[PDB]
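Hi D.,

Good news: the full-assembly prediction came through. Inputs first.
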Amino acid sequence: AARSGPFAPVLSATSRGVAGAVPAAPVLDVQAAARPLVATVGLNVPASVRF
Amino acid sequence: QSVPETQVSILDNGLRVASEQSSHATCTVGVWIDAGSRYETEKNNGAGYFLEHLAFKGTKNRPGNALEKEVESIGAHLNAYSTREHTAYLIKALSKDLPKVVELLADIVQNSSLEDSQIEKERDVILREMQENDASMQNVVFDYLHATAFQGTPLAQAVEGPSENVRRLSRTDLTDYLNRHYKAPRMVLAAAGGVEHQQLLDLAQKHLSSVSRPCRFTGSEIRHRDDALPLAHVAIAVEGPGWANPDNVTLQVANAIIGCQSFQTFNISYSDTGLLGAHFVCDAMSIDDMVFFLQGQWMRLCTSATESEVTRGKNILRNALVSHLDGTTPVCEDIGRSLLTYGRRIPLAEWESRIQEVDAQMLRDICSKYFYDQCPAVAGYGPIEQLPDYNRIRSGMFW
Amino acid sequence: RYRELARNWIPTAGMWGTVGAVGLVWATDWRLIL
Amino acid sequence: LDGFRKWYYNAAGFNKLGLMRDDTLHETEDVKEAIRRLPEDLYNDRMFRIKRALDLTMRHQILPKDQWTKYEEDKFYLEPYLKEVIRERKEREEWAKK
Amino acid sequence: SHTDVKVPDFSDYRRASSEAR
Amino acid sequence: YSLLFRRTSTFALTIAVGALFFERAFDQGADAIYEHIN
Amino acid sequence: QDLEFTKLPNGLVIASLENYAPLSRIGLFVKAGSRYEDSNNLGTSHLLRLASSLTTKGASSFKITRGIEAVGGKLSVTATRENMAYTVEGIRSDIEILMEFLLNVTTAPEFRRWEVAALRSQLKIDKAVAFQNSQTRIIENLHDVAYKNALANPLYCPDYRMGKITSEELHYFVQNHFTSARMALVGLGVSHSVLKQVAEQFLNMRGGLGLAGAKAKYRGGEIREQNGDNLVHAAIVAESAAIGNAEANAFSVLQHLLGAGPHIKRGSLLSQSVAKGSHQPFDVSAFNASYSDSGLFGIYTISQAAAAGEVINAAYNQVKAVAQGNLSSADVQAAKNKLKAGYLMSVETSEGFLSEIGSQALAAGSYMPPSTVLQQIDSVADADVVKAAKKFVSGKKSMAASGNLGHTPFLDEL
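Then the structure:
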């Protein structure tokens, strides 16, 4: 209210309930720790994470 | 309802000062002017918009930021807008400040100063925004639903005008539009909220007492195809009755019956013309199904209304079009238009009478008069390949 | 609500039947019937 | 009447193929709706029951007697839900007439 | 943007009463 | 337009009726023309 | 007819005003915002907000939707981090069944599992529509980096929690926060009596004080989101006063001195201090969000990425000038006039008036006449404003930034 000033619709959310549009808002084959990351990729060998 | 009647006292110049006192402590004092893009003659197509930009940048009395400063100091909100037929400059402010809310408005309508220096900047502002105004797809769709429906008339041209004119505009031109379309008989000083009508009339006599004293719908289609956009916006309209036509109310009830995606409905009214229709945004693949859906509905009302649904529509209209204590701004706005369009402020009791006289038979009669076997105006923007062409929409306008 | 719906089509339905019927008599070239 | 019922039960046979009453309800629009609402477990269970039945029919064979359903054990998993679908369905209908 | 160019004139085609047409 | 060209139903009726008469009329005129030629 | 604020014994604070209006409005206010969740039920208040048209014990979803649309009435849900408000409005001749529908929705939900399973996709769509603009994301990020537990919870459901919110979590949240001692029923255009009768047929059964929330703890920090937008958005806040203190009035006067939105279309010590050095387009304002235990006050900037640095610095420097006593009494008087005009225009509309009464009810159980406030805002004095400023310029800051942040400074540089 008084505090809202020009930030009301930002500190508040109002569902319409009953009374630009949404712009159309994967799955991959699947511990230790602390060894700095070194990502590797290859022409033939599949890429991997060396976490 | 004990509605506060809108007492409107006219002035010599013809400012037709009006007012609707309300308990609210703050008020909205605005000036309406019967001047829009419809009164422009394609050589000054952005004069009203560019004057609307220049009107807050200082007047003789308030050089530089004075205007904004004072209206800021007083604590009031200064707003202005322009349509194809009306221009409004209104201030929301504590009622006690009417004395200055009115004198300030007087400067804004007369004695305004269009510094060429400022003119240059506003040109840039307008131009640049326009360069981006393309982001408002909906406005685009609605400014073509206007171009293709009112081809060859002054109602096709937009409020902003083409970049061309914007760049090519000068103080004198503006001065003309200002001195031509700012006449006192075409002006309403509207006040809503905690104002006294006699004090406002005395202030209008003291200040503002100096103000000097065939549109056609063409069934057509514009298709702006750009397949990189994620969503498509399509508007389909027919010729609205007008502002004064009585059947407007039976058409509003019809819109309340209708209420894919974002399927809004509009009844835009101008002086004895208008656009009555629907705007919807959908993924391309569904545009045709939407259209089919929508056309079926209009047709439903035309031949198969139901008292129950009419009621649903009358009630939604009733809760709407109240413009009563909805706030000083909205009310003042309504008064502002009511004096410009109807020549009087229609009270809410008359609106309720015109709503309750609407039944299902006259609703399907008026809908058959305005929707059945009519040639629509279609405006599409986005991936609109599956949007049907004019024969299919033509044929869907009848069963 | 349904009654209203029915009422609206009753006359038009007859119109449709009549339309076909007019052509029917013609197509049937029945002199006995109309 | 239980005697009658139980008797009819054995006569119908849906028990023999390891299927409760509900398992044998035609998938009309409404039944289908209720089916969806079914908690996943019952759904997955329903499926195995049905799949099993199909396999047995394939061989024109019935389950060992012991595995047969029991008039008493038989539970109606969908009944509670189906009613709702019908209730909601009817409500919408009457409202239509309004 | 979207206003610079206007509807091209179809006058030639335009059949410069709608019920009659 | 307000009688036979407003709604499909109206359009249908005129078609049936008009065709009903045009048939005989056409033959009748043809009689004259045919006899005229011969 | 001054609001007949009355507190029923249970705790419900009933309030009403017979304005003899054509269109009335009845709202119900619950202290059940997103601050009452923890890490196990995040996003439950968002689904509760979107679940207002579900099947209730007394009316189905079809009956509620078709009955509210049959009379043309409106049912809406507004939610802050502290409070939820369910509001219905319509013609006076239909508000009996409107109160039936609203009180059924508040008091006796069912939360069927297929209905919430259908609603979770709408939850995702609503979150995307809400985060279509940069201000919402940067304020949510600012709250998340500013607080530790309570006010750091987002208004919108997190991405992992979609598909995981169950009926039992909604039932637990309703049973633990929708109790009578945390509820106020406020009606404009209705008789007080009816509010009470509906307050006994409903709103009286759930009468505990509910589950008490944790005290919000400040953390500080800065979260940055590099996303390649054309404009850099940056909010820098610090801890401020809470609801119920005169220092909150001092902070409101301080934001209206620094700049709290344009009064004029297309166009503030901040704005002046930025515009004297930068000719690029910008938008600098003061942000203040105060809740019943804690408040955030700071600056909000939108600017071109390149100038993003010194513009922020310029805005910060202006607040430091106010922290050094460099202000005039006419500026503070203009700030007070702007604040009181904003309050009066906020309460001049019917739904804003109903919200205000509602908030006051839940917050202090009492109604404060607009007049009273005016003299209290006047109480704030120049030094008071300066004081709040120094609080901001000293208190650990929290910074949420988004855009092309190659020239956006950090807190240790700011």
